[PDB]
Design a protein around this ligand. Structure first.
Ligand SMILES: *[C@@H]1O[C@H](CO)[C@@H](O[C@@H]2O[C@H](CO)[C@@H](O)[C@H](O)[C@H]2NC(C)=O)[C@H](O)[C@H]1NC(C)=O
Ligand SMILES: *[C@@H]1O[C@H](CO)[C@@H](O[C@@H]2O[C@H](CO)[C@@H](O)[C@H](O)[C@H]2NC(C)=O)[C@H](O)[C@H]1NC(C)=O
Ligand code: NAG
Ligand code: NAG
Ligand code: NAG
Ligand code: NAG
Lengths: 532, 532
């Protein structure tokens, strides 16, 4: 029957799921690794042992143990991102949505969730793959991976907690998809990996890591790139944070083994409770347990890999939202609140700047302030608020992405760049936050097609265009339908560096996305900080 | 008779001079110092010994020994600035234009010529004081002062060539005006000193120097300020240049006395011939022999004098032309020529930058380039040409003036700021050079009132308004006619920092002149260069 699928790990039984007046099949909660529990906490994942009998894949699995945002209880804006299932260290599962009738060999898209490497869930309502599977006739997978210390605690030199094990969870799910998706009707030769913020950085990281490159064909990076300043630390810095985590929990610190043993005795919540105490700076947009530049997953520095062409050469489609900073300013910067316009004084600006570039010396802070201050109007509360939004976005998201694009495009096989600047008409966050990171996701997954969710007609049409761009790209390496009548999203080339806006208005093509600021962030400021 | 004037130095006979259908008296070539010749070359000036008989003051005097621009022979644009009389070391004279009939006690304006401290003449057609004396009923004086090595060679510690003797020539003429102008009908209590580029810096310097402050009432600075980077050097740097000048002339360098004696044996042209060989850097807008920060004329650093209020507190009227850089780029920077549009390549830009900020290290050069490059359009030849014009102007003229204004205004008694941006319709220099430094002078002296000089009616009216602003300010401390109907030039205050445009269109008031760039040049760049 259409809902029974025999895989190399064993049989799986799915469930029939309604979607827009029709139905498809879903196989939810399929295990791809052994539970990383007990003495396997902090370890590389191990493949799931095959099972006898039929694995019930009718309901979502547990979400990984993680920090839960309780900043605005009952507010759907923040809560749409929290775990909606029980949390467990037994959380290495994937979900698959399959068109009905079962295809024979169709394009596969594997979603990798964001969450700063400290959070995220495959099971969120905004990541429900049925609309996209159904509408574009793809097989849609969502994986999971360990986050926080569970995923990224790094004691380089140890085999017990080497770092990067969350990235190895993701790799392992990609291995399973490679090995088994054919039985669901998917084409293992045509797997696009896609993700947002840490999900986008993650996609970049599998492009770079020799151990991951062969497990997929093509890649989509939403607001995230592997070289983002928040997305990796050195093995020395990872070590330092693991030790500080131990100190917060009164562990024996005399050796890696005693530390690791002490942390493995702790309930998951005891780690989460102190996780944010190990950051080296007073900062925003910095996360405690993230990928480490280990000499294995990543054989050299990300920048030397980029410069040298040491990465998978394929097609990529990528982009950023207009207001990537606003979330982190809201949560972490004085003067910004959810229910005011958040006009920012000059003194809250300066403070904002310091939180946003924690690694800068005073001269660096002056360079940033100068770059973003209109000195004819330097007490404009809105200019200050928006200027800081831009600083956080440009430094953390846009400019690293732009550097990745320009480096990748030299050796790669086709680049498509977007700038998503539509603010959804039903957004529950205040207006000042603008086009917030993550609010393109609902368009990518087709939520605007569901009448009850309160989008406009023009939002439905934007969602359909974006889904079709994404699936057509996954299918062919080009988001445009060949020889159709609609405006063409042009290739981004080294010479002309075109991109398009994504929104409800007629396509417009531009060039050199935020180039003036990205020269500052990618060339001038780093040179200043190295010299001084 | 109206043309005979008895002064404390002796009698003087002037000449009757036609001006716009009427006549006034001129007394030209009055000596105010002993000839600084022979063993008095490089010395402080000495007062002129009084004379028996009647001094013929019917013709212009000699111009001081100086570099003569021969870059464009026969071209009136460049030649209007060269000496139009014989050159001589016997050149310390002044000229006075007196209304007819002789006033009893009228406002006096004393003009101090520019020329980078290496050139200039009181006798140029563009400095003919008769139009202004006549039209505004002031007594107009033009002085002279030693330029080049003759004026500014500095061997601090020696009494034979101590530095600043050109500034002492100017002081001495101001002393003579204080002591004698009453006999010409002038009011020694109401002397405004005014000047352009090095003339404007000079005015600033008498405002600052305790030894000069008492000799005048009020001051006008056209495109020049005492803190300009080109307008002074340290005693160490002056010493270094004097020694290098000696080396170029095969002098004995064993002591100050032997050097000074060797230089005093040289014909004036032998000094001029090697004067430009002593500059420390490959540069533009840098002159070899300029004022020195000696601990006497200037008791401390110009910046400490500014910060502390150690200066004369009076009213000042000052301003800049729109395109202050274009002359020096034309003369000294690759890619700029007089008979082309001078579209500048990226590589000539970078070179331009290096010539313009010679004292900068590489990081400083990158900061300047970034500030002035539009990275969406970085190969635009016109943007590059104009961007460099702005760099040279802002760094050398506008931004130093703006710093002076803001410092002065804290302690002073009334500041009026202008931005002259009218390009004269008969300008012989190419269009790309725009509103070139020095081309407001002809408006200040009333040349547009002379039909044969080919100005428009609206240029005649701009000249009359400017002359009347200048004379009304000299007379009262405020350029506006009290209780008249015309738009009011407002005071520049610390809080609101207003200025006006000077041109043929209705007055417009603005605020914070080039503030974005002057924060870069006055605060950020110096901080960068000190740290790195
Ligand atoms: C992506 O890859 C293919 C080749 O691997 C490129 O197409 C080749 O283009 C070269 C250069 O014109 C031709 O000699 C070959 O005929 C092409 N080969 C094939 C198999 O078509 C294609 O240009 C690349 N696209 C981009 C944007 O780099
Ligand atoms: C310039 O100087 C005069 C005073 O020396 C200023 O006028 C004085 O203003 C103070 C403050 O209001 C008053 O107490 C006096 O009545 C004024 N004195 C005289 C003699 O008028 C004048 O304000 C100053 N102008 C500027 C722009 O600073
Ligand atoms: C699988 O689990 C779901 C929910 O727990 C249950 O309703 C369903 O009947 C199960 N399927 C079978 C046949 O065990
Ligand atoms: C749609 O709007 C209504 C009425 O304004 C509201 O009560 C409802 O919650 C909205 N639905 C959703 C799913 O947000
Ligand atoms: C003064 O000099 C001028 C020109 O050299 C001459 O014409 C004039 O007659 C002289 N005046 C007298 C009376 O000496
Ligand atoms: C005025 O213009 C004429 C004719 O174009 C020219 O020959 C003359 O030189 C000009 N006069 C001046 C003083 O420039």
């Amino acid at each position: 029957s259409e809902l029974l699928v025999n895989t190399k790990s064993g049989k799986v039984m799915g469930t029939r799921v309604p979607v827009l007046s029709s139905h498809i099949s879903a196989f939810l909660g399929i295990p791809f690794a052994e539970p990383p529990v007990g003495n396997m906490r902090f370890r590389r994942p191990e493949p799931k042992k095959p099972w006898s009998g039929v694995w019930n894949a009718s309901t979502y699995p547990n979400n990984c143990q993680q920090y839960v945002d309780e900043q605005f209880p009952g507010f759907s804006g923040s809560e749409m991102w929290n775990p909606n299932r029980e949390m467990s260290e037994d959380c290495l599962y994937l979900n698959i949505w399959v068109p009905s009738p079962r295809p024979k060999s169709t394009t596969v898209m594997v979603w990798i969730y964001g969450g700063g490497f400290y959070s995220g869930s495959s099971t969120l309502d905004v990541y429900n793959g049925k609309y996209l599977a159904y509408t574009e006739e793809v097989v849609l997978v969502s994986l999971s991976y360990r986050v926080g210390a569970f995923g990224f605690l790094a004691l380089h030199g140890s085999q017990e907690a080497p770092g990067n094990v969350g990235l190895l969870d993701q790799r392992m799910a990609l291995q399973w998809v490679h090995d088994n998706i054919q039985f669901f009707g998917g084409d293992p030769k045509t797997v696009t990996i896609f993700g947002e913020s840490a999900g986008g950085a993650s996609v970049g990281m599998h492009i770079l890591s020799p151990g991951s490159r062969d497990l997929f064909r093509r890649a989509i990076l939403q607001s995230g790139s592997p070289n983002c300043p928040w997305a990796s630390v050195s093995v020395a810095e990872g070590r330092r944070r693991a030790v500080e985590l131990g100190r917060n929990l009164n562990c024996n610190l005399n050796s890696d083994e005693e530390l690791i043993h002490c942390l493995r005795e702790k309930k998951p919540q005891e780690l989460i409770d102190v996780e944010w105490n190990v950051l080296p700076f007073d900062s925003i947009f910095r996360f405690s347990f993230v990928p480490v530049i280990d000499g294995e997953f990543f054989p050299t520095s990300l920048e030397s890999m980029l410069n040298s062409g040491n990465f998978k050469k394929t097609q990529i489609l990528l982009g950023v939202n207009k207001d990537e900073g606003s979330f982190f300013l809201l949560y972490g910067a004085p003067g910004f609140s959810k229910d005011s316009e958040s006009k920012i004084s000059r003194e809250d600006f300066m403070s904002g700047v310091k939180l946003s570039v924690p690694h800068a010396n005073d001269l660096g802070l002056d360079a940033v302030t100068l770059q973003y201050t209109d000195w004819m109007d330097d007490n404009n509360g809105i200019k200050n608020r928006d200027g800081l939004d831009d600083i956080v976005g440009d430094h953390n998201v846009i400019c690293p992405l732009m550097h990745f694009v320009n480096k990748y495009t030299k050796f790669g096989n086709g680049t498509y760049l977007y700038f998503f600047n539509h603010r959804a008409s039903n957004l529950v966050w205040p207006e000042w936050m603008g086009v917030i990171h993550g609010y393109e996701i609902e368009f990518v997954f087709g939520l605007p097609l569901v009448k009850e969710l309160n989008y406009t007609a023009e939002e439905e049409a934007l969602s359909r265009r974006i889904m079709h761009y994404w699936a057509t790209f996954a299918k062919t390496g080009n988001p445009n339908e060949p020889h159709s009548q609609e405006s063409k999203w042009p290739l981004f080339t080294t010479k002309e560096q075109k991109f398009i806006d994504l929104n409800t208005e007629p396509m417009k093509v531009h060039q050199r996305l935020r180039v003036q600021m990205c020269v500052f962030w990618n060339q001038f400021l780093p040179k200043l900080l190295n010299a001084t």
